[PDB]
């Protein structure tokens with residue numbers, strides 16, 4: 693396509709993949725929470741979970757925008773397309789798509805070998821992890837994005853695929869929306885073998901201690917925090933989430 697000179701990222705994960713793809717030096721704006729690699733804190737922000745700042749983007753004249761269709765507002769992305777910007781749509785469902793993203797984005801780099809290498813390395817480590825964590829048996833898990841309200845994941849949407857590599861089975865897989873709000877009772881009824889939550893919830897005392905009697909996951913000491921930066925952004929660091937998730941689901945075979 694062409695070595696881009698003024699690149700904008702509309703998502704935290706997209707900023708990580710941009711740096712891995714050898715584009716980081718050409719970024720001129722990123723999203724809120726684009727905090728990795730940490731120098732990205734230095735760049736101006738043009739997007740958050742509710743709004744893309746199209747005025748500022750006009751002001752910046754990007755020759756490449758790295759979009760996150762799954763998380764960005766559809767109307768504003770459509771506007772950017774209608775305005776004639778060159779846009780790469782980052783797809784964010786599978787683990788192999790992370791490497792695909794990096795390899796695609798490397799086409800816009802002045803040094804495509806960087807992204808070529810990063811994708812190669814990702815693919816090899818992903819292969820290593822698939823081999824290493826095959827022995828895991830199916831475990832039914834609950835993954836909490838928040839305690840108030842309880843939001844979880846469903847329909848195979850990200851990060852469902854991280855868990856599935858390890859044999860993990862989402863208790864809310866068959867929900868009518870991809871990120872459903874669920875009640876305490878809904879979880880309690882479902883009887884997850886493992887509960888995954890945030891480091892914050894653990895540190896403060898997690899909400900499921902009160903429910904030890906009704907939750908085998910609590911009796912068995914299988915409520916664990918996951919690193920949300922690794923897990924919920926599809927990036928090279930997702931392979932550390934794979935390790936973390938897979939190690940915990942391995943432990944969960946103890947009974």
Ligand code: CNC
Pocket residue numbers: 702703704705706723724725739740741742760762763764784837838843849850851871920921922924925926
């Ligand atoms: C579900 C959800 C939520 N998420 Co996320 C979490 N946890 N998230 C997700 C999942 C979305 C899946 C998808 N989009 O395909 C999921 C797990 C992948 C995700 C991921 C992230 N999220 C992140 C954050 C910080 C946030 N998330 C919230 C938006 C946060 C929400 C908190 C809340 N209670 O509202 C949340 C709990 C529910 C939003 C929703 O469903 N609204 C209903 C829907 C109809 O409204 P909506 O406006 O269309 O929602 C869309 C956006 O929120 C967008 N989106 C979701 N998260 C982000 C984060 C950013 C930076 C941006 C720009 C857009 C989003 O995706 C939604 C559609 O699926 C947030 C308000 C939580 C909080 N209170 O801190 C917050 C801050 C947003 C901000 N200031 O811009 C991450 C950076 C977390 C991390 N530690 O890495 C990460 C970024 C992903 C990436 N690609 O870079």
